[PDB]
């Protein structure tokens, strides 16, 4: 019906992609320095060129399979999100529902897996909630002794 | 299991840096630590 177009890198040179469908072509107010807004929210570039052609699906989609596991990756120092990417692949849980029937050299399973209390909208398509690899543990940040 | 089936290799200017054109095709953060870092990519 012509609503989506498979764009490669070379053809990516001739187009002007928007970022946020809604906030990227609504009208003027404007807001910037104009009263009033939410002080605690972030500062966005703003749309300043308007002769768009395409528009992105949802930015979270720039990510990979291991990376979309991370909660709020846009609040972390970059090299950190790369570490979690390597470790997520070395965590432990349900690796297939048929583990009791296969015969493969070495395999680990978690007595009591849990779906995390904080999740990505992208975990949904990766079926992480049905095959988790961690436990929601109660955690304290203190000194307490020195061990 | 998922993350291995989407893996990109590269044999041997500066082909390790994350290049602008990677936007939305290869994932920025996903990549192996040390040894062969950045020659390997996840989609």
């Amino acid at each position: 019906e012509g609503l989506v177009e498979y764009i490669d890198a070379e053809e990516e040179e001739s187009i002007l992609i928007a970022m946020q469908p809604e906030d990227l072509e609504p009208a003027e107010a404007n807001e910037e320095n104009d009263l009033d807004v939410d002080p605690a929210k972030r500062i966005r570039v703003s749309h300043h060129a308007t002769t768009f052609t395409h528009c992105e699906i949802h930015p979270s989609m720039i990510l990979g399979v291991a990376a979309s596991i991370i909660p709020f990756p846009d609040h972390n120092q970059s090299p950190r999100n790369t570490y979690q990417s390597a470790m997520g692949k070395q965590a432990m849980g349900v690796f297939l529902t048929n583990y009791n029937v296969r015969m493969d050299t070495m395999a680990n399973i978690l007595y009591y897996p849990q779906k995390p209390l904080g999740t990505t909208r992208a975990m949904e398509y990766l079926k992480f909630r049905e095959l988790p690899a961690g436990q929601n543990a109660i955690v304290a940040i203190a000194c307490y002794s020195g061990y | 299991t998922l993350s291995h089936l989407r893996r990109t290799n590269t044999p041997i200017a500066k082909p390790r840096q994350l290049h602008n054109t990677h936007w939305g095709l290869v994932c920025p953060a996903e990549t192996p630590e040390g040894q062969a870092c950045g020659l390997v990519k996840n989609l």
Binding site: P21, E22, H58, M61, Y125 | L2, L5
Partner: peptide
């Protein structure tokens, strides 16, 4: 009202229907 454009949440419904097809290894399969 079928006219008003896509917004915040609506952006996801598309995604899921993308995966409802190609799944997760389409490149490998195709």
């Amino acid at each position: 009202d079928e006219s008003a454009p896509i917004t915040a949440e609506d952006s996801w419904a598309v995604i899921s229907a993308f995966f409802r097809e190609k799944g997760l290894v389409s490149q490998q399969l195709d």
